[PDB]
Amino acid sequence: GLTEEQRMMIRELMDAQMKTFDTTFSHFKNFRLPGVLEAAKWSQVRKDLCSLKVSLQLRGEDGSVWNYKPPADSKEIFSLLPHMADMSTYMFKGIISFAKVISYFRDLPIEDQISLLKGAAFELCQLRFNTVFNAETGTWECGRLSYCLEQQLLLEPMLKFHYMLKKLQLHEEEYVLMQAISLFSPDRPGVLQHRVVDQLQEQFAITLKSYIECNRPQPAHRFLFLKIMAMLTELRSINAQHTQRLLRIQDIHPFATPLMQELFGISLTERHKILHRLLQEGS
Amino acid sequence: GLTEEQRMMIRELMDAQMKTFDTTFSHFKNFRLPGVLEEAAKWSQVRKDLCSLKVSLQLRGEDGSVWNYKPPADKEIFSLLPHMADMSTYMFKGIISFAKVISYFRDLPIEDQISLLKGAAFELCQLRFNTVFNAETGTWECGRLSYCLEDLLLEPMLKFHYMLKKLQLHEEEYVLMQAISLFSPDRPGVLQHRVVDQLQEQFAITLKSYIECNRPQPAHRFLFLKIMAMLTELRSINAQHTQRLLRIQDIHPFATPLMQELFGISLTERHKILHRLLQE
Ligand SMILES: CCC[C@H](CC)Oc1ccc(C(C)(C)C)cc1NC(=O)c1nnn(-c2cc(OC)ccc2OC)c1C
Ligand SMILES: CCC[C@H](CC)Oc1ccc(C(C)(C)C)cc1NC(=O)c1nnn(-c2cc(OC)ccc2OC)c1C
C-alpha cells in the first residue's frame, strides 16, 4: 500500500510520539498552582482570556480530587498563568524530545533545529492537546490534571480549532504527520536550509496524503488531506496571534518560564542556551 | 430578672468567649492540607472509625476563587488527619484561653485546671463548632474554610449537631453550656470535687434562670433539661471519639504535641505544654 520509506517514515514518527508524549502527565510535577487565598493595554488582554476560562482538577493516586474554580472577571485573571506556563513548558520539553528522536531532524544544523522548534513549539503543543481534548465535556484530560472550560466561545480561534480538528477523528498517524509537517516548516524565521527542510516537508505531506488514501474509503473522510493542510495553515495563523498576545501579558504580568522566555525573544545558540542544552541531551 | 451575681457570671463568660473565640477563623493559618499525590483488627477498627464522618473541604479565596477537596474512598483514609490535627490544636488553644479568662477557673489548683481542660477540650470544641454549623447545607462555616458532609444521623456526633442547632440557643446559653461542661466535678484527676460541683451548680442555676427570664414561659419549660441532656450525650461522645483517636494514633501517628498531652500519649509533668499555656 505504502512505499517502503513511507512505511518507515510513519513508524519512526509513531515511535517518537510514543517515547516523548507523556499522555498521563505522570512525570509532570513541581508545578505552580493558584494560591489558597494603559486602559487598552489591560482591556484588550482581558477580552480574549474569558473565552479560555478553565477550572483545574487534580486527581490523586488515592482517589481524592482537588478542584479549582477560577475567580470571576473583575489582577485576578492571571491566577492560572503560572500553572499554564509550567504545563506548556513541560509539553514543549516533550516536543523537543520528539524532534530529537526523528533522524531527519538530527541531521539539520543546530541553529536550524533551534529555529524550527521555535516556530512550531506552540503548533505542536496544541496538536498534542487536541488528542487529549474531550469534545463533549470541553475538557483536556491530562492524566492527573483536567482543564474544564467555563457559541460565543467558538468565536475564539483556538477553541474553534480544537473542536474542528477533533471532529475530523484523526488517527494517531495523521496527528504525528501533522506535527512533522508543522515542525519542518522551511519558511520559519531564522531557517538556513530552506531547500532541505522544504524537501522534507513535502515528503511528509505526500506520506500523509498516501496514508489517508489507503485507510479512509469512507465519505466522511472525503477531502481529509486538504482539510488537514488547511487546519495546519490556520494553526500557523493562530500561532502568530497568540504568541503576540502572550508578549503583551508578559509585558504587563511576567509569567513565562525561563525556557518560554527563550521562545519569545525576551548568536542564536547563545540566546537559546536551555533549548540548545536540551537538544544535546539524550533521551 | 437575674441576680446581679448571675448577670456578672454571664458578663464574664461572654467576655471570655468574645476574647477567645475567633468566630471568623481569621488567625487559623499555616495549616496542613491533603497532598496532591492483631494489626489486622487494628486496621479493622480504624477503617470503621474514619468512614463514619467523611467530609469534603472547601477553600474560598481572597480573589473569589474556590479550592475544593473531595476525600477518597476506603493508607488513604488518613488524608485529612493532619489538617484536622491542625484545626483541633488551634481550637483547643482558644478553649485554653477561654478558661484562663474566667476568674473562677484561675483560682483552681493548676493540676485541677489541667484535669478539667483535659476532659472538656473535645466537648467545648464541638459546642463552638455548633455555632458555625449550617443545618440546611450540612456545613461547618469556618470563615474561609468550609467542611461539607458527604452523603448520617445514625452517628451520634452527627445527630448531636443537628439536635443542638434545632434548639437555636443564644450566645449566653452556649457560653453557659461551655461553663457547665468545663466545670465538671467528675473528670479524671479532679481534686477539688466539692468546689467544682458548687461552681457547676451556679452555672446551671444561672442557665435555668436565664431561660426563665428571656424565653416564653410554656414553650421553653423543658429547654434547660434539653440542654442538660445534650451535655450528657456530648460527654458520652467525648469518651467514644477520644478512644477512637487513640486507636488511629496507635497505627498512624498524627496528633500534634499539644494533642498528645490531651490523650495521654505528676499531672503537670506529663502535660508540660498545657502547663505552659496556663502560666502565660
Ligand atoms: C489547549 C490550550 C492549552 C491550555 C490547556 C487546557 O489551555 C488553556 C486554558 C486556560 C488558559 C488561561 C487563560 C486560564 C490561563 C490558557 C490556556 N492555554 C495556555 O496556557 C497555552 N497554550 N499554549 N501556550 C504556548 C506554549 C508555548 O510553548 C511553550 C508558546 C506559546 C504559547 O502561547 C502562545 C500557552 C501559554
Ligand atoms: C464535627 C466538627 C469537627 C470536624 C469538622 C467537620 O469534623 C470532622 C470531620 C472529619 C474528620 C476526619 C475523620 C476526616 C479526620 C474528623 C472530624 N472531627 C475532628 O477532627 C475532631 N473534632 N474534635 N476533636 C477533638 C478535639 C479535642 O480537643 C479540642 C480532643 C479530642 C478530639 O477528638 C476526640 C477532633 C480530633
Residue numbers in the entry:
A (entry chain B): 142 to 178, 195 to 231, 234 to 309, 316 to 431, 445 to 461
B (entry chain A): 142 to 178, 194 to 230, 234 to 310, 318 to 431, 445 to 459
Give the exact sentences the study uses for this entry.
As a xenobiotic sensor, PXR is activated by structurally diverse compounds and plays a major role in drug metabolism and drug-drug interactions by regulating transcription of genes encoding drug metabolizing enzymes, drug conjugating enzymes, and drug transporters. Here, we report structurally related PXR-selective agonists and antagonists and their corresponding co-crystal structures to describe mechanisms of antagonism and selectivity.
The electron density in PXR LBD complexed with the racemic SJPYT-278 mixture indicates the presence of both (R) and (S) enantiomers, likely because they have similar PXR LBD binding potency. The SJPYT-312 complex allowed visualization specifically of the (S) enantiomer. Agonistic and antagonistic activities were evaluated using a luciferase reporter under the control of a PXR-responsive CYP3A4 promoter, and as predicted, analogs with the 4-methoxy (SJPYT-326 and SJPYT-328) are agonists, and all compounds lacking the 4-methoxy (SJPYT-278, SJPYT-312, SJPYT-313, SJPYT-327, SJPYT-330, and SJPYT-331) are antagonists. Like SJPYT-310, all compounds reposition F251 and the α12 residues L428 and F429. The antagonists SJPYT-312, SJPYT-331, and SJPYT-278 lack the region A 4-methoxy group and cannot effectively engage the α12 cleft. Furthermore, all antagonists consistently lose PXR L428 contact with the SRC-1 LXXLL residue L690, while the interaction is maintained by agonists. Therefore, we performed MD simulations of PXR LBD bound to agonists (SJPYT-326 and SJPYT-328) or antagonists (SJPYT-312 and SJPYT-331).
